[PDB]
């Protein structure tokens, strides 16, 4: 029972921290504005419907 | 004298208009915010001294 519980608790807790991560779609246009790039840029994805 | 006031007139309408538009200085790096670049650009001058 003590396994069964843990197998448990990583399923809901993996599934927790990509919820909080990521989300549950993906967008076609990602919009970034990090350093060493200027104020503000716009990258497109690879295949943002089939994943 | 009515010639003497009236290119001083022009004179100062175009040293108004010149302080309106441009300023007195050329700095070295521009910001583009127009239709058709994505949101904001910077463009570098040439010469930005010599003039």
Known sequence: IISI???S????????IQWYIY????SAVY???????????DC???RPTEK
């Open 31 to 41: 919009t970034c504005k990090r350093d060493p790039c200027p104020h503000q840029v």
């Open 23 to 26: 989300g549950f779609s993906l």
């Open 44 to 46: 497109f994805l690879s």
């Open 9 to 16: 608790i990583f399923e809901v807790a993996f599934l927790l």
């Open 5 to 7: 519980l843990f197998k």
